[PDB]
Amino acid sequence: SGAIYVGNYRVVNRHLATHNDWANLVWEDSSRDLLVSSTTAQGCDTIARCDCQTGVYYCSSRRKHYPVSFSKPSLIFVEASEYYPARYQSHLMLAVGHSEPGDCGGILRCQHGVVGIVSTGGNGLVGFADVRDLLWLDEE
Ligand SMILES: COc1ccccc1CCN1C[C@@H](C(N)=O)CCC1=O
Ligand SMILES: [Zn+2]
C-alpha cells in the first residue's frame, strides 16, 4: 500500500483505490495502474520534473529503502494478476530490486522529488508507474 500526497491530490495504484477515492475522483488510467483523488488537507510530497534513471524506493516487505537504477518509462507486458489480465502497461520503469504484491504504492524518489510508485514486480524485479509527465499535479 502507499500513496503520493501532492497539493490537494492523492495518487494511488488504481487497483488499490478505495470507495472514497472513486467518490472524489480526479483522473484514472487502467493502462498506467494510476488513480488520483482529491484531498481536503494539503500534502507535502513534491513531484520530480527530470530525466533521472537512478533513485531510491521504499520496500514494505523489507521495511527498507533501496537505491536502484531504473529503465525509462515504456510499454511493458505485465503478467496476469488478481487485478488485471495479462496486458501491456504504459509509462512503466523496471529495476532490479526485491518486491512482493503488497509493496505496490511504495514511493520511488530522486534528488528532485517523487518519480513514481511501485506497481509491478517479481523474481528480483520491481516496476514503477512514472508520474513525472503529469504536470497538472503541480497546480489547481
Ligand atoms: C510489486 O509487485 C509485485 C511483486 C511481485 C509479484 C507480483 C507483483 C504485482 C503483480 N500485480 C501487478 C499489478 C499491475 N500493475 O498490473 C496489479 C496487481 C498485482 O498483484
Ligand atoms: Zn531527478
UniProtKB/Swiss-Prot annotation:
Zn(2+) 1 binds at residues 50, 52, 110, 112. Coiled coil: none annotated. The active site is at residues 15, 33, 104. It catalyses: Selective cleavage of Tyr-|-Gly bond in the picornavirus polyprotein. Cysteine protease that cleaves viral polyprotein and specific host proteins. It is responsible for the autocatalytic cleavage between the P1 and P2 regions, which is the first cleavage occurring in the polyprotein. Also cleaves the host translation initiation factor EIF4G1, in order to shut down the capped cellular mRNA translation. Inhibits the host nucleus-cytoplasm protein and RNA trafficking by cleaving host members of the nuclear pores. Counteracts stress granule formation probably by antagonizing its assembly or promoting its dissassembly. Homodimer. This is Protease 2A. It comes from Coxsackievirus A16 (strain G-10).
